Enzyme design. Sequence first.
Site, short mmCIF file in Angstrom:
data_model
loop_
_atom_site.label_atom_id
_atom_site.label_comp_id
_atom_site.label_asym_id
_atom_site.label_seq_id
_atom_site.Cartn_x
_atom_site.Cartn_y
_atom_site.Cartn_z
CG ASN A 8 -1.81 1.23 1.28
OD1 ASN A 8 -2.08 1.86 0.26
ND2 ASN A 8 -2.26 1.57 2.48
CE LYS A 10 0.26 3.64 4.26
NZ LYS A 10 0.03 3.32 5.69
CG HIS A 92 -5.91 1.29 4.96
ND1 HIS A 92 -5.35 2.20 5.84
CD2 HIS A 92 -4.98 0.33 4.76
CE1 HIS A 92 -4.12 1.81 6.13
NE2 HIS A 92 -3.87 0.68 5.49
CD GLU A 94 -3.07 5.06 6.36
OE1 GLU A 94 -3.22 5.30 5.15
OE2 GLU A 94 -2.02 4.55 6.82
CD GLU A 162 -3.27 -3.10 7.26
OE1 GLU A 162 -2.09 -3.16 6.84
OE2 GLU A 162 -4.05 -2.18 6.92
N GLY A 168 2.19 1.97 10.84
CA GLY A 168 3.06 3.13 10.76
C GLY A 168 3.89 3.44 12.00
CB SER A 208 5.02 -1.82 11.85
OG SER A 208 4.51 -0.50 12.02
#
Lengths: 244, 244
Positions: A8, A10, A92, A94, A162, A168, A208
Site C-alpha cells: 500500500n 498510500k 483501510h 486510515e 491490521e 506506521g 509495520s
Amino acid sequence: RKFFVGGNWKMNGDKAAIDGIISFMKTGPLSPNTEVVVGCPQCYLMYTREHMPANIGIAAQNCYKVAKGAFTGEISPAMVKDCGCEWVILGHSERRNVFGEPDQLISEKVGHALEAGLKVIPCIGEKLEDREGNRTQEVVFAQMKALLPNISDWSRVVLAYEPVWAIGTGKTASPEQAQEVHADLRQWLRDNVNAEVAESTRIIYGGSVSAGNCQELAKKGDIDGFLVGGAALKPDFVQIINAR
Amino acid sequence: RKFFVGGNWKMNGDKAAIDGIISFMKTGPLSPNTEVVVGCPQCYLMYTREHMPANIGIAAQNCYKVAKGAFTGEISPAMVKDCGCEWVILGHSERRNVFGEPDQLISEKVGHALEAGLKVIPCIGEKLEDREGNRTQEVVFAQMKALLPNISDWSRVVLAYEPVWAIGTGKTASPEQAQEVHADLRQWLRDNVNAEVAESTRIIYGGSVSAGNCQELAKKGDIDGFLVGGAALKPDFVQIINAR
C-alpha cells in the site's frame, strides 16, 4: 492458499518514484509463488498499470458504492476497471479513522466492488484500547459480521488484519498475537460461511511489516501474507514478497 | 474579470465518455474570452490532460493538505501537478455534505494547494434552511472567513458560490438571488482584503446552470462565470461557455 503480499503506497508517489519501485520490483527477484498487488494513489491507476509487469496486480486505494453519480472526488469500481486494474483496498484504517468511514459504508463499497467485478482487500482491525481491554476478538468479529452480507464472492476476497496500533508505528504485532487473531478469523469463516471458504480465503497481516520481521510472521500457520505500507516504498519490499 | 466557466464531471466518466466530451469541446466554438476548466475524476487526471486540448484547464476534484503521507485513498497537489494539471476544486458541497469535510480542513487544503502552486476553486454556499431563515450572508461570510487565513495568493483563486439547494436539483438560483450573494461576497473582499482583489477576483455561480438559463445569470454585474455539473457532460456545455 497462495501467499499474498500487497504494497500500500498510500499517499506517496509521482511518475518518477513509481518508475523506481517498478524498477526494483522487476529486478526482484520475486518469488513466483507470491501473488503481488500494489495499491497506488487514485491518480496513478492507469499509469502504474501501463508500466508495471502484467504479473503484478494493481489496486485502487478507495472507491465509492455506485457506478457513477454526484460524488465529487470519488471514483467507482467501473472506473478502476476502465483504468485496467483489478483490485481495490477497502476500509483501510486510515479511511476509517482519519476520514470517518463507518462499517456500514465499507460493507456497501465491498458489495459494489464485487458486483462490479473487482477483487477486494477488505481491511479490519482493533484499536489500542480494544487490545488492552481484551476485546480484540469481539471487535474484529463485529467488523466481519458487518461485511458478511456484502461478500458475494469469497474467491475474490483477501482479508487484511491490521491492528490500528501497529500501522506506521513500528509496533508490529508479534507472530503469536497475529497468529491468534488469524486463527480466530479462520474459524469465524467456518462457523459463518463454510469450511471450504475458511480453508481457501487468504488472511493477511499488516501493521509495520518489515524485511526484518516478515519471516517469523509468515511461518505462522494462519498468516497467508502481508499488507505493507512504509516498507513497500523501498527495495526491502522484495524480502517481504519473499518471506517464505 | 475574465469570464470563467468550469465543468465538474463529478463521479462520471470512462475513457470513451471523456473522448466524447473532448470531441464536442474541440468542435466548439469556444469563446477566446472564456477561461475554461474541467474537473475530472481522480483517476483520469493524466488521461484527460493528455487528450483534452491544452487551452482547456484540468482540475482535480479533491486533494489532501500535505504533499505525501499516511492517507490511503488521497492524492496531493504535488500529484495533481505531476499529472500535468493546474487546478483543484476544494470544499465542494458534495465533499462537505456527503463526506463531512469541515471548513477548517477545507481551508488547510486550499492553503496547501496554493503553496504547491495549484490554482484553486474553493466552493462556498448556504443550505436551504439558511436561505429560508434569512441567514445566507452570515453563512457565506463565515465560510469565507474560514478560508481567509489560507488564501496566500488571490491571483490563483476563483471562488464558486453554489447554493446547496441548487446543486443537481434543477432548483437554480434566480439571477437576482445569485447576483445579491455575489455582490455581498465582493464587498466582503473589499472589507477583508482590498479593492484591487475585490475587483479582480472571479466569483462564479453554480447550481443547476443550463443552456436555457445561463444567459440571464451571466448578464448580472457580479457573476463572472459558472461551475457546471450536469450540463457539463453534454454538448450544451459549449453554449454555457459562451453565455456572456
